[PDB]
Amino acid sequence: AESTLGAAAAQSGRYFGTAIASGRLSDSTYTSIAGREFNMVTAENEMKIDATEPQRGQFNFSSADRVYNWAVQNGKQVRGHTLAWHSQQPGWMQSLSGSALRQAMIDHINGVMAHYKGKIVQWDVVNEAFADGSSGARRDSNLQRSGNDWIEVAFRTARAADPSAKLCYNDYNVENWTWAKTQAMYNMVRDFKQRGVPIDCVGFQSHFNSGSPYNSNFRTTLQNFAALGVDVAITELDIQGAPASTYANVTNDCLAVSRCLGITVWGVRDSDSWRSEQTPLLFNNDGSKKAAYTAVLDALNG
Ligand SMILES: O[C@@H]1[C@@H](O)[C@H](O[C@@H]2CCNC[C@H]2O)OC[C@H]1O
């Protein structure tokens, strides 16, 4: 048994990660708790399209490198998030459509992956391409309006740019095996594997709440995607109210699936959360451990 989340996960060959915000790297409580507890880092915002390419052709890795360098200095690996997404696009990309947008999407993947070549274990190459609800349709965005092949082209571009990186598709509301959105993602990955589209991993954001609740069939979802020949990862876990029971269920689901690489929670303290009002993380505002922290650590330790 180990006394910290990352070390506990590492005993079964897994990681335990968090999202890191560069502007908070001067906060001593934040940096010391995150340093101690996690062995994997995702940049919360700094590796997104707008942050990394604020003007077309003009990259800015200053804040991204602050996160990457903090991670490596503190003994963590890094998940890159995210190369192609409808949200947080810079204005210049929002205005593009069609073939011009396709070229800009490819150029953006190539430039960011070149900067980090060989240094990023997993990339969320494409994020949030499915619509919510019963349709299983693609989300409407400039990217999707450029053609159904946007996702496959992003993945082929990424495979050529950095053959060492594991290439992930990441989404939310895709954890419950019975949901239409989950099945749409399953059918896409299955099709990609049939047609030779490079995809190595699927990320399950795991933003659980009353409208999108945890279900024990998450373990079935994880198993069934692993059986397609991809790794699986829990990428942005948070749980409304932070119940200990659900936090332990999720942890045990990952521990039960050989190709589940690890778990990232989407922040450190409740006050760091994008959904702080839902008190959905493992640490209190003062940095003390919540009941859910103990439940996770115990589950990791068997
Ligand atoms: O700071 C906020 C981030 O936490 C938020 O991150 C997204 C959560 C949902 N899945 C994708 C993540 O990038 O993005 C908005 C930002 O304001």
Curated annotation (Swiss-Prot):
Pathway: Glycan degradation; xylan degradation. Its EC number is 3.2.1.8. One of its GO terms (biological process) is xylan catabolic process. The active site is at 128 (proton donor), 236 (nucleophile). Residues 1-299 form the GH10 domain. Keywords: Carbohydrate metabolism, Disulfide bond, Glycosidase, Hydrolase, Lectin, Polysaccharide degradation, Secreted, Signal, Xylan degradation. GO terms for cellular component: extracellular region. One of its GO terms (molecular function) is carbohydrate binding. It comes from the Bacteria. The keyword Signal applies. It catalyses: Endohydrolysis of (1->4)-beta-D-xylosidic linkages in xylans. It is found in: Secreted. It is an enzyme of class 3 (hydrolase). Belongs to the glycosyl hydrolase 10 (cellulase F) family. Contributes to hydrolyze hemicellulose, the major component of plant cell-walls. XLNA and XLNB seem to act sequentially on the substrate to yield xylobiose and xylose as carbon sources. This is Endo-1,4-beta-xylanase A. It comes from Streptomyces lividans. The chain holds residues 42 to 343 of 477 of the full protein.
